[PDB]
Amino acid sequence: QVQLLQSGAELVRPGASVTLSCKASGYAFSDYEIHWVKQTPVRGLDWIGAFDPKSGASASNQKVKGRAILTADKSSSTAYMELRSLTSEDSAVYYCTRLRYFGYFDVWGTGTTVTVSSASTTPPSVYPLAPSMVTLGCLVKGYFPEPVTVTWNSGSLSSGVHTFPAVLQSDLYTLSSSVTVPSSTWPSETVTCNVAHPASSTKVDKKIVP
Amino acid sequence: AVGIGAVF
Amino acid sequence: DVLMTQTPLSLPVSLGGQASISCRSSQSVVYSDGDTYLEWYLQKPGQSPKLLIYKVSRRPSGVPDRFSGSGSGTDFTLKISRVETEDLGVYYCFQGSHVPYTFGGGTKLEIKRTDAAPTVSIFPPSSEQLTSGGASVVCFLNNFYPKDINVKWKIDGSERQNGVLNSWTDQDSKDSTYSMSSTLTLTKDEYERHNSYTCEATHKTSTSPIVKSFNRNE
């Protein structure tokens, strides 16, 4: 049941600092080190640094050096990594992961999508798409930054869902989602698309109506 | 991995 | 640092075939205790990386024996023996012996499957979008293979190219197909000055376009 808890997103202006947190749940915090890994879009993983709760030792990769400060609050079971003086090159998804001595990375957080930009957050404008099986859709248009989360019927509808990756145009992101359901279930039953935009802390539900 | 505190 | 050179960048493999991924370190990765901390990770789309192999060839429980690793000195190899739809993603080698720990550049596994034709659906702009003065017509092209596909938009029979935006999913983890979304955005005044909107998808599975369309007057 071991878990590592991470923020979904952070919008950072160029030159500013970000602090990422990794909160353990379900294991004794001091028995494992916490390591941080950077995932660049499409391809690439980079080991950024680590902190060892047992000995207090810390290290980081020299490509970021001078800018990473790794710490831990043992009473909160929480690890922290401060990254200072961000630029566009620092935009990525940051994961934390745990490591026992002479072990391996067995558990991972879900990652924090860090965007470095001077634009302000924009919540999505979500639009229902309505017209054998019936395919219904949701258009999530004009939001910044990434990511959004899309579920159908609050996640109870999971088979036959396609969520298409966002494209950036005019400095705002757009994506779509399609769900395919039996003709028997709609419009007789409600089909709602649920969008969440963590960087603006907003949530939206759109009922698909004939 | 070995771990950054394994040798202390 | 220890450089990790990973090949190939992209690995197409048929369902049930054999995939092999190589990694070449710039130096020996043996640690002072005598053990070698070479590890292999898979990042499936939408998910965190997960370990498959540790200490060159050892396998944690829950990882099938279809995944196997081997290595001497600088040279390391990971082998997937019977590729399954769920094995898609980007694979990374990793050395955990010398700080800073390093990953290879990654190898994207692409699964070759039998051809499948798109299911096509067309959607008029919602009234809620129309209240703000823009209008987006959407066409979904779902569960087709191979990934390449063409879409063409016709307003009142005339081709339209400006205002089209297309996005492809990653390969499906369960049926190894692809899907694509096409969106045409117009002014609401421009949307109201014409009547028929058509989306036509042309794909390798057939010589004839699969056509869908609507009229606002219906």
Side-chain angles (χ1 to χ4, degrees):
Chain A
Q1 43 259 59
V2 187
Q3 229 162 310
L4 306 163
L5 275 195
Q6 276 188 282
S7 157
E10 308 288 3
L11 189 62
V12 175
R13 325 185 73 58
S17 307
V18 62
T19 302
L20 313 154
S21 101
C22 187
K23 185 190 165 123
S25 355
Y27 78 99
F29 180 73
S30 313
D31 317 55
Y32 295 82
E33 303 183 356
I34 293 304
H35 295 232
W36 303 80
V37 168
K38 159 171 175 180
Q39 176 226 303
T40 48
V42 188
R43 186 176 300 252
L45 292 178
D46 291 309
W47 185 86
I48 295 301
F51 182 95
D52 170 34
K54 184 158 336 173
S55 87
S58 89
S60 49
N61 180 340
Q62 256 170 226
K63 309 332 124 224
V64 316
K65 258 291 184 88
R67 305 201 282 124
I69 290 138
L70 298 119
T71 52
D73 177 339
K74 303 223 254 175
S75 65
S76 323
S77 277
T78 300
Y80 299 92
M81 164 161 84
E82 194 196 353
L83 216 64
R84 296 187 315 209
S85 257
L86 299 212
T87 67
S88 268
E89 305 301 318
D90 294 293
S91 315
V93 177
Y94 290 84
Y95 292 88
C96 60
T97 173
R98 70 163 200 178
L99 166 74
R100 202 193 53 201
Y101 293 156
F102 314 111
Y104 55 87
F105 298 146
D106 56 11
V107 181
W108 295 68
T110 59
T112 302
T113 307
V114 169
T115 295
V116 183
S117 183
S118 40
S120 75
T121 48
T122 308
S125 349
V126 190
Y127 299 129
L129 303 167
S132 91
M133 301 231 273
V134 60
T135 303
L136 304 166
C138 236
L139 186 55
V140 189
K141 167 159 167 94
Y143 70 89
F144 190 84
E146 283 278 55
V148 290
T149 253
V150 196
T151 66
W152 292 84
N153 284 344
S154 318
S156 35
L157 242 183
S158 150
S159 331
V161 155
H162 281 125
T163 297
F164 304 80
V167 198
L168 177 68
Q169 214 170 224
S170 273
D171 312 294
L172 303 174
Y173 286 99
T174 303
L175 69 72
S176 39
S177 191
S178 85
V179 67
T180 281
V181 296
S183 267
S184 136
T185 86
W186 189 85
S188 27
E189 293 163 57
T190 53
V191 168
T192 314
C193 98
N194 318 103
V195 175
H197 186 227
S200 72
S201 299
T202 51
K203 278 196 92 321
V204 181
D205 286 12
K206 289 310 186 169
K207 170 154 153 224
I208 303 321
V209 192
Chain B
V2 167
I4 69 170
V7 277
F8 300 116
Chain C
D1 317 330
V2 163
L3 274 292
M4 306 293 278
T5 310
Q6 214 182 129
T7 44
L9 283 35
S10 163
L11 193 44
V13 55
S14 291
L15 253 196
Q18 204 218 62
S20 115
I21 301 169
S22 288
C23 186
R24 169 116 90 193
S25 64
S26 54
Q27 63 180 260
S28 149
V29 277
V30 184
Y31 191 59
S32 106
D33 65 343
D35 278 329
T36 295
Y37 299 77
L38 230 286
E39 292 154 31
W40 290 91
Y41 290 84
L42 173 61
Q43 203 182 1
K44 279 182 239 202
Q47 270 153 274
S48 70
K50 317 257 206 261
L51 186 121
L52 313 179
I53 293 300
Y54 74 99
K55 291 206 213 142
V56 180
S57 38
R58 292 187 216 186
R59 234 181 58 249
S61 148
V63 170
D65 36 44
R66 335 190 267 96
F67 303 87
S68 125
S70 60
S72 36
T74 269
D75 286 333
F76 295 90
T77 297
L78 170 79
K79 242 184 261 313
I80 305 130
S81 259
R82 301 158 270 288
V83 182
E84 300 220 298
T85 60
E86 278 99 350
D87 298 348
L88 97 100
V90 187
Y91 287 85
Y92 301 86
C93 65
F94 170 85
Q95 79 79 25
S97 286
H98 294 126
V99 196
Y101 303 146
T102 42
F103 294 85
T107 296
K108 183 165 152 242
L109 200 104
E110 284 219 315
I111 295 153
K112 279 132 79 192
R113 77 144 273 162
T114 71
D115 303 357
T119 306
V120 187
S121 323
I122 189 157
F123 298 89
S126 59
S127 35
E128 324 211 332
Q129 176 178 206
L130 282 177
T131 74
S132 36
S136 293
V137 204
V138 171
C139 212
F140 293 129
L141 285 53
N142 282 17
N143 315 65
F144 62 83
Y145 182 94
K147 18 165 185 181
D148 263 316
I149 184 151
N150 292 341
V151 66
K152 281 94 180 214
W153 284 92
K154 273 129 101 159
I155 310 152
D156 276 347
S158 211
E159 189 171 340
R160 179 60 166 252
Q161 273 151 24
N162 207 13
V164 167
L165 192 55
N166 301 144
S167 185
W168 274 256
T169 67
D170 313 90
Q171 196 155 16
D172 192 293
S173 68
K174 278 119 181 159
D175 70 17
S176 295
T177 59
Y178 296 93
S179 312
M180 187 266 254
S181 162
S182 192
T183 296
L184 183 77
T185 312
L186 330 152
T187 294
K188 170 197 147 225
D189 272 330
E190 210 214 316
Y191 173 67
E192 306 203 301
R193 257 193 324 252
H194 306 291
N195 183 69
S196 115
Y197 298 83
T198 312
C199 146
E200 326 190 305
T202 306
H203 186 232
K204 128 160 204 231
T205 50
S206 158
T207 172
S208 306
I210 289 176
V211 156
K212 278 306 194 300
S213 102
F214 78 96
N215 289 163
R216 60 221 273 282
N217 90 329
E218 184 264 330

PDB file of all heavy atoms in Angstrom, chain C residues 115-142:
ATOM      1  N   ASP C 115      -3.925  -4.722 -39.764  1.00  0.00           N
ATOM      2  CA  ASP C 115      -4.571  -3.467 -40.125  1.00  0.00           C
ATOM      3  C   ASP C 115      -6.006  -3.444 -39.621  1.00  0.00           C
ATOM      4  O   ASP C 115      -6.665  -4.483 -39.520  1.00  0.00           O
ATOM      5  CB  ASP C 115      -4.546  -3.251 -41.636  1.00  0.00           C
ATOM      6  CG  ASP C 115      -3.141  -3.263 -42.204  1.00  0.00           C
ATOM      7  OD1 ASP C 115      -2.188  -3.389 -41.410  1.00  0.00           O
ATOM      8  OD2 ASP C 115      -2.991  -3.133 -43.444  1.00  0.00           O
ATOM      9  N   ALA C 116      -6.466  -2.237 -39.260  1.00  0.00           N
ATOM     10  CA  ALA C 116      -7.820  -1.982 -38.774  1.00  0.00           C
ATOM     11  C   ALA C 116      -8.325  -0.645 -39.300  1.00  0.00           C
ATOM     12  O   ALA C 116      -7.588   0.346 -39.294  1.00  0.00           O
ATOM     13  CB  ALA C 116      -7.852  -1.968 -37.241  1.00  0.00           C
ATOM     14  N   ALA C 117      -9.593  -0.605 -39.730  1.00  0.00           N
ATOM     15  CA  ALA C 117     -10.088   0.658 -40.278  1.00  0.00           C
ATOM     16  C   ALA C 117     -10.657   1.564 -39.181  1.00  0.00           C
ATOM     17  O   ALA C 117     -11.139   1.077 -38.149  1.00  0.00           O
ATOM     18  CB  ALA C 117     -11.155   0.404 -41.347  1.00  0.00           C
ATOM     19  N   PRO C 118     -10.566   2.883 -39.364  1.00  0.00           N
ATOM     20  CA  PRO C 118     -11.130   3.820 -38.379  1.00  0.00           C
ATOM     21  C   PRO C 118     -12.652   3.753 -38.241  1.00  0.00           C
ATOM     22  O   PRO C 118     -13.372   3.590 -39.224  1.00  0.00           O
ATOM     23  CB  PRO C 118     -10.695   5.189 -38.933  1.00  0.00           C
ATOM     24  CG  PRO C 118     -10.599   4.965 -40.380  1.00  0.00           C
ATOM     25  CD  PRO C 118     -10.012   3.591 -40.532  1.00  0.00           C
ATOM     26  N   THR C 119     -13.143   3.940 -37.007  1.00  0.00           N
ATOM     27  CA  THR C 119     -14.529   4.360 -36.791  1.00  0.00           C
ATOM     28  C   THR C 119     -14.585   5.885 -36.733  1.00  0.00           C
ATOM     29  O   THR C 119     -13.848   6.491 -35.957  1.00  0.00           O
ATOM     30  CB  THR C 119     -15.082   3.753 -35.501  1.00  0.00           C
ATOM     31  OG1 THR C 119     -14.914   2.330 -35.543  1.00  0.00           O
ATOM     32  CG2 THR C 119     -16.573   4.116 -35.296  1.00  0.00           C
ATOM     33  N   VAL C 120     -15.489   6.501 -37.504  1.00  0.00           N
ATOM     34  CA  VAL C 120     -15.486   7.949 -37.709  1.00  0.00           C
ATOM     35  C   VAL C 120     -16.779   8.557 -37.186  1.00  0.00           C
ATOM     36  O   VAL C 120     -17.871   8.076 -37.514  1.00  0.00           O
ATOM     37  CB  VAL C 120     -15.277   8.305 -39.193  1.00  0.00           C
ATOM     38  CG1 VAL C 120     -15.103   9.802 -39.377  1.00  0.00           C
ATOM     39  CG2 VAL C 120     -14.072   7.574 -39.735  1.00  0.00           C
ATOM     40  N   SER C 121     -16.651   9.660 -36.431  1.00  0.00           N
ATOM     41  CA  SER C 121     -17.797  10.369 -35.869  1.00  0.00           C
ATOM     42  C   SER C 121     -17.610  11.874 -35.968  1.00  0.00           C
ATOM     43  O   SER C 121     -16.520  12.393 -35.721  1.00  0.00           O
ATOM     44  CB  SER C 121     -18.006  10.007 -34.398  1.00  0.00           C
ATOM     45  OG  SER C 121     -17.729   8.647 -34.177  1.00  0.00           O
ATOM     46  N   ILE C 122     -18.689  12.578 -36.280  1.00  0.00           N
ATOM     47  CA  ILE C 122     -18.651  14.019 -36.498  1.00  0.00           C
ATOM     48  C   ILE C 122     -19.588  14.698 -35.506  1.00  0.00           C
ATOM     49  O   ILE C 122     -20.624  14.137 -35.130  1.00  0.00           O
ATOM     50  CB  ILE C 122     -19.019  14.373 -37.953  1.00  0.00           C
ATOM     51  CG1 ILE C 122     -18.748  15.853 -38.225  1.00  0.00           C
ATOM     52  CG2 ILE C 122     -20.455  13.975 -38.246  1.00  0.00           C
ATOM     53  CD1 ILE C 122     -18.553  16.183 -39.678  1.00  0.00           C
ATOM     54  N   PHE C 123     -19.190  15.891 -35.044  1.00  0.00           N
ATOM     55  CA  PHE C 123     -19.854  16.602 -33.963  1.00  0.00           C
ATOM     56  C   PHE C 123     -19.947  18.091 -34.247  1.00  0.00           C
ATOM     57  O   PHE C 123     -18.921  18.748 -34.483  1.00  0.00           O
ATOM     58  CB  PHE C 123     -19.118  16.377 -32.651  1.00  0.00           C
ATOM     59  CG  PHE C 123     -19.085  14.949 -32.223  1.00  0.00           C
ATOM     60  CD1 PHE C 123     -18.058  14.108 -32.639  1.00  0.00           C
ATOM     61  CD2 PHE C 123     -20.092  14.437 -31.417  1.00  0.00           C
ATOM     62  CE1 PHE C 123     -18.030  12.787 -32.242  1.00  0.00           C
ATOM     63  CE2 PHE C 123     -20.077  13.119 -31.016  1.00  0.00           C
ATOM     64  CZ  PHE C 123     -19.042  12.285 -31.426  1.00  0.00           C
ATOM     65  N   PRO C 124     -21.155  18.645 -34.234  1.00  0.00           N
ATOM     66  CA  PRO C 124     -21.343  20.089 -34.420  1.00  0.00           C
ATOM     67  C   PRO C 124     -20.892  20.865 -33.197  1.00  0.00           C
ATOM     68  O   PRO C 124     -20.723  20.292 -32.112  1.00  0.00           O
ATOM     69  CB  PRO C 124     -22.861  20.228 -34.632  1.00  0.00           C
ATOM     70  CG  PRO C 124     -23.381  18.811 -34.761  1.00  0.00           C
ATOM     71  CD  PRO C 124     -22.427  17.947 -34.023  1.00  0.00           C
ATOM     72  N   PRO C 125     -20.644  22.164 -33.340  1.00  0.00           N
ATOM     73  CA  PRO C 125     -20.316  22.968 -32.161  1.00  0.00           C
ATOM     74  C   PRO C 125     -21.465  22.975 -31.166  1.00  0.00           C
ATOM     75  O   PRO C 125     -22.637  23.001 -31.540  1.00  0.00           O
ATOM     76  CB  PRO C 125     -20.064  24.370 -32.738  1.00  0.00           C
ATOM     77  CG  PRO C 125     -20.557  24.324 -34.159  1.00  0.00           C
ATOM     78  CD  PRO C 125     -20.459  22.914 -34.594  1.00  0.00           C
ATOM     79  N   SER C 126     -21.117  22.950 -29.887  1.00  0.00           N
ATOM     80  CA  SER C 126     -22.115  23.080 -28.838  1.00  0.00           C
ATOM     81  C   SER C 126     -22.663  24.504 -28.800  1.00  0.00           C
ATOM     82  O   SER C 126     -21.974  25.466 -29.146  1.00  0.00           O
ATOM     83  CB  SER C 126     -21.494  22.728 -27.494  1.00  0.00           C
ATOM     84  OG  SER C 126     -20.395  23.593 -27.256  1.00  0.00           O
ATOM     85  N   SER C 127     -23.912  24.637 -28.346  1.00  0.00           N
ATOM     86  CA  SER C 127     -24.485  25.971 -28.193  1.00  0.00           C
ATOM     87  C   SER C 127     -23.696  26.820 -27.197  1.00  0.00           C
ATOM     88  O   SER C 127     -23.570  28.045 -27.377  1.00  0.00           O
ATOM     89  CB  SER C 127     -25.944  25.846 -27.755  1.00  0.00           C
ATOM     90  OG  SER C 127     -26.117  24.727 -26.895  1.00  0.00           O
ATOM     91  N   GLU C 128     -23.140  26.189 -26.154  1.00  0.00           N
ATOM     92  CA  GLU C 128     -22.354  26.933 -25.174  1.00  0.00           C
ATOM     93  C   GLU C 128     -21.118  27.554 -25.809  1.00  0.00           C
ATOM     94  O   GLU C 128     -20.748  28.684 -25.472  1.00  0.00           O
ATOM     95  CB  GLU C 128     -21.928  26.024 -24.025  1.00  0.00           C
ATOM     96  CG  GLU C 128     -22.942  24.988 -23.616  1.00  0.00           C
ATOM     97  CD  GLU C 128     -22.832  24.667 -22.142  1.00  0.00           C
ATOM     98  OE1 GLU C 128     -21.714  24.799 -21.595  1.00  0.00           O
ATOM     99  OE2 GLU C 128     -23.865  24.314 -21.523  1.00  0.00           O
ATOM    100  N   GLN C 129     -20.470  26.842 -26.739  1.00  0.00           N
ATOM    101  CA  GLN C 129     -19.359  27.456 -27.461  1.00  0.00           C
ATOM    102  C   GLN C 129     -19.853  28.568 -28.375  1.00  0.00           C
ATOM    103  O   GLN C 129     -19.186  29.603 -28.522  1.00  0.00           O
ATOM    104  CB  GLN C 129     -18.586  26.412 -28.276  1.00  0.00           C
ATOM    105  CG  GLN C 129     -17.493  27.052 -29.109  1.00  0.00           C
ATOM    106  CD  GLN C 129     -16.661  26.063 -29.915  1.00  0.00           C
ATOM    107  OE1 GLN C 129     -15.503  26.339 -30.242  1.00  0.00           O
ATOM    108  NE2 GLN C 129     -17.247  24.914 -30.243  1.00  0.00           N
ATOM    109  N   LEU C 130     -21.037  28.390 -28.967  1.00  0.00           N
ATOM    110  CA  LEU C 130     -21.559  29.397 -29.883  1.00  0.00           C
ATOM    111  C   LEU C 130     -21.849  30.714 -29.178  1.00  0.00           C
ATOM    112  O   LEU C 130     -21.716  31.777 -29.796  1.00  0.00           O
ATOM    113  CB  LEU C 130     -22.803  28.866 -30.597  1.00  0.00           C
ATOM    114  CG  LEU C 130     -22.438  27.899 -31.735  1.00  0.00           C
ATOM    115  CD1 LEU C 130     -23.666  27.314 -32.394  1.00  0.00           C
ATOM    116  CD2 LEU C 130     -21.582  28.624 -32.747  1.00  0.00           C
ATOM    117  N   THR C 131     -22.216  30.674 -27.881  1.00  0.00           N
ATOM    118  CA  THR C 131     -22.484  31.920 -27.152  1.00  0.00           C
ATOM    119  C   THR C 131     -21.258  32.826 -27.044  1.00  0.00           C
ATOM    120  O   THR C 131     -21.418  34.025 -26.776  1.00  0.00           O
ATOM    121  CB  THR C 131     -22.999  31.660 -25.735  1.00  0.00           C
ATOM    122  OG1 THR C 131     -21.909  31.224 -24.915  1.00  0.00           O
ATOM    123  CG2 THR C 131     -24.149  30.636 -25.702  1.00  0.00           C
ATOM    124  N   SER C 132     -20.047  32.275 -27.157  1.00  0.00           N
ATOM    125  CA  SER C 132     -18.810  33.050 -27.090  1.00  0.00           C
ATOM    126  C   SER C 132     -18.266  33.457 -28.465  1.00  0.00           C
ATOM    127  O   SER C 132     -17.177  34.037 -28.528  1.00  0.00           O
ATOM    128  CB  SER C 132     -17.728  32.271 -26.322  1.00  0.00           C
ATOM    129  OG  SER C 132     -17.809  30.876 -26.569  1.00  0.00           O
ATOM    130  N   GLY C 133     -18.980  33.161 -29.558  1.00  0.00           N
ATOM    131  CA  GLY C 133     -18.604  33.611 -30.887  1.00  0.00           C
ATOM    132  C   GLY C 133     -17.643  32.746 -31.692  1.00  0.00           C
ATOM    133  O   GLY C 133     -17.290  33.137 -32.813  1.00  0.00           O
ATOM    134  N   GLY C 134     -17.203  31.598 -31.178  1.00  0.00           N
ATOM    135  CA  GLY C 134     -16.437  30.667 -31.991  1.00  0.00           C
ATOM    136  C   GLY C 134     -17.179  29.355 -32.191  1.00  0.00           C
ATOM    137  O   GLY C 134     -18.127  29.076 -31.447  1.00  0.00           O
ATOM    138  N   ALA C 135     -16.770  28.526 -33.161  1.00  0.00           N
ATOM    139  CA  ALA C 135     -17.455  27.255 -33.378  1.00  0.00           C
ATOM    140  C   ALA C 135     -16.461  26.203 -33.846  1.00  0.00           C
ATOM    141  O   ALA C 135     -15.754  26.405 -34.835  1.00  0.00           O
ATOM    142  CB  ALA C 135     -18.590  27.411 -34.393  1.00  0.00           C
ATOM    143  N   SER C 136     -16.441  25.065 -33.159  1.00  0.00           N
ATOM    144  CA  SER C 136     -15.500  23.992 -33.437  1.00  0.00           C
ATOM    145  C   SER C 136     -16.281  22.749 -33.824  1.00  0.00           C
ATOM    146  O   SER C 136     -17.117  22.266 -33.048  1.00  0.00           O
ATOM    147  CB  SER C 136     -14.610  23.712 -32.221  1.00  0.00           C
ATOM    148  OG  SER C 136     -13.757  24.810 -31.957  1.00  0.00           O
ATOM    149  N   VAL C 137     -16.014  22.254 -35.030  1.00  0.00           N
ATOM    150  CA  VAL C 137     -16.553  20.997 -35.533  1.00  0.00           C
ATOM    151  C   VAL C 137     -15.506  19.919 -35.313  1.00  0.00           C
ATOM    152  O   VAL C 137     -14.333  20.104 -35.655  1.00  0.00           O
ATOM    153  CB  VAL C 137     -16.927  21.110 -37.020  1.00  0.00           C
ATOM    154  CG1 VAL C 137     -17.980  20.065 -37.375  1.00  0.00           C
ATOM    155  CG2 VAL C 137     -17.407  22.531 -37.366  1.00  0.00           C
ATOM    156  N   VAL C 138     -15.911  18.796 -34.738  1.00  0.00           N
ATOM    157  CA  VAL C 138     -14.956  17.791 -34.297  1.00  0.00           C
ATOM    158  C   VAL C 138     -15.229  16.490 -35.035  1.00  0.00           C
ATOM    159  O   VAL C 138     -16.388  16.119 -35.244  1.00  0.00           O
ATOM    160  CB  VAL C 138     -15.020  17.597 -32.760  1.00  0.00           C
ATOM    161  CG1 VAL C 138     -14.176  16.401 -32.309  1.00  0.00           C
ATOM    162  CG2 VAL C 138     -14.546  18.860 -32.046  1.00  0.00           C
ATOM    163  N   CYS C 139     -14.160  15.778 -35.389  1.00  0.00           N
ATOM    164  CA  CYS C 139     -14.258  14.468 -36.012  1.00  0.00           C
ATOM    165  C   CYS C 139     -13.302  13.543 -35.272  1.00  0.00           C
ATOM    166  O   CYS C 139     -12.113  13.852 -35.158  1.00  0.00           O
ATOM    167  CB  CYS C 139     -13.903  14.547 -37.506  1.00  0.00           C
ATOM    168  SG  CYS C 139     -14.778  13.368 -38.545  1.00  0.00           S
ATOM    169  N   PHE C 140     -13.823  12.432 -34.743  1.00  0.00           N
ATOM    170  CA  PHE C 140     -13.012  11.401 -34.094  1.00  0.00           C
ATOM    171  C   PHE C 140     -12.831  10.231 -35.049  1.00  0.00           C
ATOM    172  O   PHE C 140     -13.806   9.761 -35.644  1.00  0.00           O
ATOM    173  CB  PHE C 140     -13.642  10.878 -32.794  1.00  0.00           C
ATOM    174  CG  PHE C 140     -13.709  11.883 -31.689  1.00  0.00           C
ATOM    175  CD1 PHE C 140     -14.908  12.106 -31.020  1.00  0.00           C
ATOM    176  CD2 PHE C 140     -12.588  12.597 -31.297  1.00  0.00           C
ATOM    177  CE1 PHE C 140     -14.994  13.040 -30.000  1.00  0.00           C
ATOM    178  CE2 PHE C 140     -12.664  13.540 -30.261  1.00  0.00           C
ATOM    179  CZ  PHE C 140     -13.866  13.756 -29.620  1.00  0.00           C
ATOM    180  N   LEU C 141     -11.589   9.761 -35.174  1.00  0.00           N
ATOM    181  CA  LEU C 141     -11.180   8.635 -36.010  1.00  0.00           C
ATOM    182  C   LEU C 141     -10.532   7.593 -35.090  1.00  0.00           C
ATOM    183  O   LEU C 141      -9.329   7.665 -34.817  1.00  0.00           O
ATOM    184  CB  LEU C 141     -10.196   9.104 -37.084  1.00  0.00           C
ATOM    185  CG  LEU C 141     -10.647   9.891 -38.317  1.00  0.00           C
ATOM    186  CD1 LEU C 141     -11.458  11.089 -37.976  1.00  0.00           C
ATOM    187  CD2 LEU C 141      -9.437  10.317 -39.129  1.00  0.00           C
ATOM    188  N   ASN C 142     -11.304   6.607 -34.641  1.00  0.00           N
ATOM    189  CA  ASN C 142     -10.912   5.771 -33.515  1.00  0.00           C
ATOM    190  C   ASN C 142     -10.510   4.351 -33.924  1.00  0.00           C
ATOM    191  O   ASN C 142     -11.079   3.765 -34.860  1.00  0.00           O
ATOM    192  CB  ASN C 142     -12.053   5.742 -32.490  1.00  0.00           C
ATOM    193  CG  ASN C 142     -12.098   7.008 -31.644  1.00  0.00           C
ATOM    194  OD1 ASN C 142     -11.498   8.024 -31.998  1.00  0.00           O
ATOM    195  ND2 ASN C 142     -12.822   6.961 -30.539  1.00  0.00           N
TER     196      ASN C 142
END
